[PDB]
From Swiss-Prot, chain A:
Leftover remarks: Present with 306000 molecules/cell in log phase SD medium.
Name of the protein this chain belongs to: 26S proteasome regulatory subunit RPN1
Highest taxon of the lineage: Eukaryota
Family assignment from sequence similarity: Belongs to the proteasome subunit S2 family.
General function of this protein: Acts as a regulatory subunit of the 26S proteasome which is involved in the ATP-dependent degradation of ubiquitinated proteins.
Species name: Saccharomyces cerevisiae (strain ATCC 204508 / S288c)
PC repeat ranges per the UniProt record: 7-41, 42-82, 85-117
Entry's transmembrane regions: none
UniProtKB/Swiss-Prot annotation, chain B:
Covered range of the whole protein: 1 to 78 of 398
Role, per record: Plays a central role both in proteasomal degradation of misfolded proteins and DNA repair. Central component of a complex required to couple deglycosylation and proteasome-mediated degradation of misfolded proteins in the endoplasmic reticulum that are retrotranslocated in the cytosol. Involved in DNA excision repair. May play a part in DNA damage recognition and/or in altering chromatin structure to allow access by damage-processing enzymes.
Residues in Ubiquitin-like domain copies: 1-77
Locations listed in the record: Nucleus; Cytoplasm
Other facts noted in the record for this chain: Present with 10900 molecules/cell in log phase SD medium.
Superkingdom of source: Eukaryota
Annotated protein name in UniProt: UV excision repair protein RAD23
Residue location of crosslink Glycyl lysine isopeptide (Lys-Gly) (interchain with G-Cter in ubiquitin): 49
Taxonomic lineage from the root: Eukaryota, Fungi, Dikarya, Ascomycota, Saccharomycotina
Complexes and interactors: Interacts directly with PNG1.
Amino acid sequence: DTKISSAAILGLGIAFAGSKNDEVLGLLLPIAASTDLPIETAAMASLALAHVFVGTCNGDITTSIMDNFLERTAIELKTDWVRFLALALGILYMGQGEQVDDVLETISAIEHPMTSAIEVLVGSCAYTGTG
Amino acid sequence: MVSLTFKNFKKEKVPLDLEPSNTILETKTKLAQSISCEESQIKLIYSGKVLQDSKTVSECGLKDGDQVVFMVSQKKST
């Protein structure tokens, strides 16, 4: 009873792991926030990327993801979603990554619609500083 | 002859020269003609306070040789 959608992102998921070049991202990232594609496939694709670049890291990725947090209407699904989304925007930085500083700076700055909860979340837990 | 620095998100500085009169419209235009990105997506912020195209530099609260916060978007915007 597997869906065809999941079967898709799945296959590709194993593809990237077969080539960590700058092309995959040069096409994926952009599509993650091109025109105005449904926040459905877009979100799912967001987890596939992070899962791959789990080891690597980049700010640009946070640039597009940020713009999304804004236009975020949540008018679609309103049940269990902040968790996952929060994870990425969070785990994305386990430690040693000033990038987090530049983030909270933008998030909060850009008014305060519905990102406070996430602001305090990533705010407290961040630079683990593993001695 | 005030020269400020516009930082994006990668912690990069983009020096720019303006005047008490010059407004965000122009700073946005230049900052866009410097990096090669349209100002229709750019977000000219100021100390975590997204400025406004309706505010000049004097109103922005900037001074001689300061720092401005900004960011670029991906939406081409119609």
